[PDB]
């Protein structure tokens, strides 16, 4: 289905810049979750939950170690050609990693922001170790944008398939097609059309603009993760 599009000398670096966004999202979670997992060690009633989070933070840490040790230039044959790799061949594994990560975050986000928040309140009768409302918003906002970015990488190059579909994107499509399909005015984030890109230059440029947006969201996420770490410290952690 894809593009005619070949790799250039600047492709390797573009890929490292995309992967670095994913490493930064993963690391941000890993850092806050180490902290939460440390506080929870002192709450007897949250022992099993603590283990469930440990199981998630390992998965993230594994994904992040994988991404950080991946050398993208190893897997790219530029020519001088037609030995040259197609751009699709090169983006596909990156997109596939993004999809895996995103689905993992969806499962973790549900556990972390919904069921566990409730369980915590039910078990401890206070809000000392809950998340802030603003952290939950930053969580959802960041996920939504990484979903969309991943959708854009895949659809813009026409490398989509059932196997690369994200649950939340398909949900919004299926929901629209049995609720209306208000497909012009379209408030839904995920339901907006993605234009095919026609060259690597056009991809490069849209990547960079995406990079600026996601970096923004990652910094807001880091901000809120520090606010919540501080809260846990002030409300639970520190002595009295």
């Amino acid at each position: 289905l894809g593009s005619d599009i070949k790799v250039t000398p600047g492709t390797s670096e573009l890929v490292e810049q995309i992967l670095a966004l994913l490493s930064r999202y993963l690391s941000s979670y890993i850092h806050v979750l180490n902290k939460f997992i440390s506080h929870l060690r002192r709450v007897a009633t949250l022992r099993f939950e603590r283990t469930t989070l440990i199981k998630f933070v390992k998965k993230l840490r594994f994904y992040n170690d994988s991404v950080l040790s991946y050398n993208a230039s190893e897997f790219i044959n530029e020519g001088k050609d037609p030995e040259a790799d197609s751009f699709d061949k090169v983006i596909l594994p990156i997109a596939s990693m993004f999809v895996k990560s995103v689905e993992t975050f969806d499962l973790l986000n549900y556990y972390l922001t919904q069921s566990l928040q409730k369980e915590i309140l039910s078990k401890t009768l206070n809000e000392d170790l809950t998340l802030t409302a603003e952290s939950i918003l930053a969580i959802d906002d960041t996920y939504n944008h990484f979903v969309k970015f991943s959708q854009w990488m895949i659809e813009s190059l026409r490398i989509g398939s059932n196997l690369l579909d994200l649950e939340v994107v398909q949900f919004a499509i299926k929901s629209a097609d049995e609720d209306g399909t208000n497909i012009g005015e379209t408030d839904n984030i995920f339901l907006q059309e993605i234009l095919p890109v026609n060259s690597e230059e056009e991809f490069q440029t849209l990547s960079a603009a995406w990079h600026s947006i996601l970096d923004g969201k990652l910094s807001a996420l880091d901000e809120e993760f520090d606010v919540v770490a501080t809260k846990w410290h002030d409300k639970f952690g520190k002595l009295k």
Binding site: K148, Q192, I194, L195, I213
Partner: peptide
């Protein structure tokens, strides 16, 4: 959703 100029 913050989408780039022209996705």
């Amino acid at each position: 959703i913050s989408v780039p100029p022209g996705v």
